[PDB]
Amino acid sequence: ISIVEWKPFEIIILLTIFANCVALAIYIPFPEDDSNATNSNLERVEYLFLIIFTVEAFLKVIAYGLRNGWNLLDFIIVVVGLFSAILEQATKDVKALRAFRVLRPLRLVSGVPSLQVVLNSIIKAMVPLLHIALLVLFVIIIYAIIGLELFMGKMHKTCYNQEGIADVPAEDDPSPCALETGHGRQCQNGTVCKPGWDGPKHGITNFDNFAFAMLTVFQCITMEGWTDVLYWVNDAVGRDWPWIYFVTLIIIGSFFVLNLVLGVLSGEFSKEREKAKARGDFQKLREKQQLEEDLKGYLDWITQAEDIDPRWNRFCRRKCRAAVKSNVFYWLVIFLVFLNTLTIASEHYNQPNWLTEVQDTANKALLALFTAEMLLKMYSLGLQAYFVSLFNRFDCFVVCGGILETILVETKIMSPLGISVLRCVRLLRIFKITRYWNSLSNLVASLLNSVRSIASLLLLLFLFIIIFSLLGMQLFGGKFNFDEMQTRRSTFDNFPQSLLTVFQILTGEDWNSVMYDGIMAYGGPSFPGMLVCIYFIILFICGNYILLNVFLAIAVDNLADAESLTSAQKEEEEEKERKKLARTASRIVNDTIFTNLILFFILLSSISLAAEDPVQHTSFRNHILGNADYVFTSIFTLEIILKMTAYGRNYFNILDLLVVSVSLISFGIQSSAINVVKILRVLRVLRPLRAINRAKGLKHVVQCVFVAIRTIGNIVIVTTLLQFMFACIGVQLFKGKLYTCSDSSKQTEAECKGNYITYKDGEVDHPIIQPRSWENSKFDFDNVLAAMMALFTVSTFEGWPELLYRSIDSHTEDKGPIYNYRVEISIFFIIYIIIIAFFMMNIFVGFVIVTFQEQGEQEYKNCELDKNQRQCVEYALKARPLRRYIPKNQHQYKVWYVVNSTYFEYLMFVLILLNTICLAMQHYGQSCLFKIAMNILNMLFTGLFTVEMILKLIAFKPKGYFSDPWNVFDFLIVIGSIIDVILSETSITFFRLFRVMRLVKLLSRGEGIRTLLWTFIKSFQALPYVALLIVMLFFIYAVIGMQVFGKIALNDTTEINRNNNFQTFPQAVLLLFRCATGEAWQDIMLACMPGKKCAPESETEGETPCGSSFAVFYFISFYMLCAFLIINLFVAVIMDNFDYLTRDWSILGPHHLDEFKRIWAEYDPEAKGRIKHLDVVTLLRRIQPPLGFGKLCPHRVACKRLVSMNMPLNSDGTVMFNATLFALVRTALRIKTEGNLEQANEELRAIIKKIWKRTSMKLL
Ligand SMILES: CC(C)CCC[C@@H](C)[C@H]1CC[C@H]2[C@@H]3CC=C4C[C@@H](O)CC[C@]4(C)[C@H]3CC[C@]12C
Ligand SMILES: CC(C)CCC[C@@H](C)[C@H]1CC[C@H]2[C@@H]3CC=C4C[C@@H](O)CC[C@]4(C)[C@H]3CC[C@]12C
Ligand SMILES: CC(C)CCC[C@@H](C)[C@H]1CC[C@H]2[C@@H]3CC=C4C[C@@H](O)CC[C@]4(C)[C@H]3CC[C@]12C
Ligand SMILES: CC(C)CCC[C@@H](C)[C@H]1CC[C@H]2[C@@H]3CC=C4C[C@@H](O)CC[C@]4(C)[C@H]3CC[C@]12C
Ligand SMILES: *[C@@H]1O[C@H](CO)[C@@H](O)[C@H](O)[C@H]1NC(C)=O
Ligand SMILES: [Ca+2]
């Protein structure tokens, strides 16, 4: 049968896999053992599938005798299927191991060798990320322990009315309160704080054990629902110090970690494109584009002689060619496209009846005129030269589609879908007048050249979603049916619904809600029931990795080729225009101590602006700051006065005078103080912007951002055009259709008047009368300016499922919703998310990365210096031996040898590991015996750690002990726990947090974690001004928010509450941080719209005077600018460390060169520079051949060359470490024949940093 398992028997079993994948998507999970006919026949078909796979297993197991992973997986699936079928026939948890059927789609990857390569390229890019997964795990553990020690059991009480404990009488969302002696949220008028409450999320979200806390910390790290936890803690303990926990956790484990991931992935993509260039693949793309260039060239020249007639087309056809390329037929078509866009983007809801006539006549006249355009271009330029180009085929398709789809809406067969909106994609022809069109054409060329790889990465992305959708359907199918009056929309009941839910989890929005529903579907918070959260954890952290390795590996690997093609076409043009044109052509202003004081006053005038009181119109604090501004602006005027004697202007003194003039005319009017003041006090936020031209480096990192902004002017305009097109298509689908009545039984505005009966919590015995209101969606598709705002919030992955499930229910204009009407309309949102929120955003990030690479890398050195020998010679010049501190008076040497042994390290590491375990099982509700045991167990750990501190201080001496930073870090921990024990046997918690920091010592171990973290921290420190831009942005926007939305009333049912408001600078900064992390920022935006209530203190005109419409611009601009600046800082830090991110550890470098120092250390205690001649035999053989040679005996050619290379100018064993290191590194790489020593001598004084005449002894 070794013959029968070849030929298309492997295609038969592939079609069988495809059939079993369709028989899995048709199955409908029914609650409580229900079924239908289809699910009854599918089980019968499973027998055929299983019998087919079992004979495949037989024929491959008696013909091969398993070693491969895929065949073993197939055997496992077959065995589990047999066992499940037999068990089900026996009983007739039975159907609980059917979840192994979802691993059968994984056989499609193995069935074709063209996708195994892609899967391996995706999976092997992950092993460099295991040095970031460990860091994330350590951060999670440390923060879980800190939350255990800070917020354990504090979220188990809430307002309970005053009749007893009836049922959590505060809406459907009860929040934790605190007792009258507490510092948390106090209960309302007719309520009392009383314990005995499940928890904020049915007891799932809390810090009770190391299982709840370790999952709450992870959920916060994924930046989803972290403000909810922060506000629950705020209501529990207080509003003073949970932000120090949560904001630090977000910064350390969500932004820093993502920066590390981006750096490691970009340095790995570059370290493969460099290999591809070395082998050669750009040449194929380059030598193909010039081919069709001449095939667009000479092949038009052949057709230009087609009508040289020596039957009378020369009169007209010669003019048709001229007119087409006359810059008249190029501007006329642009004007027509602009007109078409104008009449397409003018379709609103309830438009005037004449507009719907003008636009439909235009949609026919312009369509006919464009058809005439096509016909004129085709026959007058060759019918096969109209297919050579890419826009020409696109225009052909769009014209033909417009003509075809016009009829289907003309006579009612089909409902409009905006087919002509794609002529706009011809406005991108206006880029021809700009230089930014050869750059945008090569990107499309690379995208269309790597189509076979894009369509395979997308296929793997879809297979992942399908497999996890089937698994979620198996687990949670027919289980999200709870008795609560709300029917969950994101469920796992169908195949399309499962696909939508898995896609929503992959996008990240509200994944924690689906996880909570899944946890409560399998019971509640309990050991066996809560174990179904690994599904949502693994799905999130293994789908967000695939979404970032599929789309970034397409953006960066294609933009790098696009820029290479652009460079090639830019040098070819220059060479042609240079050689082809070569045969024919041939006073205290300038102080230093005064500018730094003016800068201090500038920075002081911005604190008096952030300390104001937005609400209280008249207050004491508002009086001195209004009084201190008099002296503040006078000095800025005296500085401005003193600068007109010096000279008589630049583009920064304009702003410097603008602020002073604004302040003066603010104090100038002083009489119209109800007007202008609230539109002139907003321009006071330009006060911090006066340090841009006074704090050089801040001037450089503002020039760099403005140079970088003009470079992304292609990615920002193409994305805007795509968003406009998608909005125009969405207005034709959801205009006038997203309206709803409060009474779900009424589907007309003339039918939604009056009051209706509502039942609280679905209790029929408790009716409540509510008014009937006809309302629209929060974000609608009525205009072309509302669709672009509804789509922006979708692209930011905020509240997009709500819009999805509101648009699915829409069926008819001027009508209400219908449950699951057009579930097939979700493809619109899926395509928009894939194209805009996944493809174009990653293109923008990759463009920033590549642009920074070229901007900061093209200089290099231009003088040989290969990219390892550079640092090799640099450290050869700058080096010295280490210090050892051997303890003379051997009474100390015994203890020192004991301490510096390799067993003390393991003993201490095990001690820390046991301490972190003893701190990891302090639960809530522990018995008193457990608490006393915990105390008299921490006692021993503190004792052994203080004796180890003493026994290390004795050996290393107080001079050599505290010198190393690690001992002083442990010194506080031991002291922080010694005093903690004393005050624990008898009120503070900050001393307990010291013990957890001991795990940081274990974290900072290994040569990968330590090196990566240290290099990234150093790169962060090397650019302190790039991070100042974000601080300035946050400060400016916080001040603006304080002056605009600072007076809005604090209702707890809105998004402007006690926790979230603009009433203080810290609160405004926290709100802006929340919006930067993307946490219902659109809800805060809509809670700041005009027509809300002002606030007690901020003074009637109180109909509703608060809210500005400035909110839309404020929030959208802040989101865009914050994202841009965060990406800017991220890429700057990443490419400040690109020599480590592309290290190629298999070749010489700092790693072995630094170890040479330590292997020297013992032989030479002091630095000095004197050597032992006994070294030769063992010197290089001590470590490895990567530095020296492979431990060979001191009689080989390697040993002969060890002495043959003359030690530079040193008698006997007095060679300096620099000389021997340089000789070693020049033997290891870049070897040269004798007589070139003077060449190296002259090279080491030309382009390297100054030697300071310190190589005078190292010359020969
Ligand atoms: C060429 C592209 C980029 C810009 C097109 C701008 C025009 C066609 C669009 C943009 C903003 C639109 C307006 C946005 C809002 C309103 C208010 C309401 O009464 C519906 C129509 C009306 C008045 C729209 C008419 C069409 C409109 C003016
Ligand atoms: C591979 C990843 C994505 C999924 C892992 C699934 C496995 C390891 C987990 C996740 C869900 C878990 C189930 C969750 C809840 C229950 C209900 C109860 O009767 C105990 C066992 C049982 C049935 C668990 C068994 C183990 C389980 C099936
Ligand atoms: C480098 C600079 C720009 C960073 C920002 C520092 C300034 C603007 C911030 C940092 C901390 C802030 C203070 C934090 C807390 C309070 C208490 C509050 O009841 C009034 C405002 C006041 C007094 C803030 C004034 C502005 C402040 C001093
Ligand atoms: C860091 C390593 C040791 C992981 C720690 C896991 C162990 C030690 C922790 C995590 C989950 C914990 C359990 C979670 C919930 C409860 C219910 C509570 O009413 C009694 C304690 C008990 C039963 C906890 C005991 C300790 C526990 C088993
Ligand atoms: C929220 O604000 C106040 C606070 O009570 C009140 O008007 C009402 O509860 C809410 N506002 C509206 C308009 O419903
Ligand atoms: Ca969200």
Describe the structure.
Residues 212-233, 497-518, 785-805, 1068-1086 dip into the membrane without crossing it. The chain has a two-stranded antiparallel sheet with strand order 1-2. Strands 3-6 form a two-stranded antiparallel sheet. It is globular. With 1260 residues, the protein is an all-alpha fold. α18 crosses α21 (534-550) and α22 (552-579) crosses α32 (826-857). The protein has 49 helices and six strands. It binds cholesterol (4 copies), 2-acetamido-2-deoxy-beta-D-glucopyranose (NAG) and calcium ion (CA).
Topology:
Blueprint: H1 9-25, H2 37-64, H3 69-91, H4 106-111, H5 113-123, H6 130-150, E1 157-159, E2 193-195, H7 212-221, H8 226-236, H9 243-279, H10 282-295, H11 298-304, H12 317-324, H13 331-344, H14 355-379, H15 390-410, H16 438-449, H17 451-476, H18 495-507, H19 511-521, H20 527-530, H21 534-550, H22 552-579, H23 595-605, H24 607-610, H25 621-646, H26 653-669, H27 677-680, H28 700-711, H29 715-734, E3 740-741, E4 755-759, E5 767-771, E6 774-775, H30 784-795, H31 800-808, H32 826-857, H33 869-877, H34 891-899, H35 902-918, H36 928-963, H37 965-984, H38 993-996, H39 998-1003, H40 1009-1022, H41 1026-1045, H42 1065-1076, H43 1081-1086, H44 1110-1135, H45 1138-1141, H46 1150-1161, H47 1197-1204, H48 1217-1228, H49 1237-1243
Antiparallel strand pairs: 1-2, 3-6, 4-5
The chain binds cholesterol (4 copies), 2-acetamido-2-deoxy-beta-D-glucopyranose (NAG) and calcium ion.
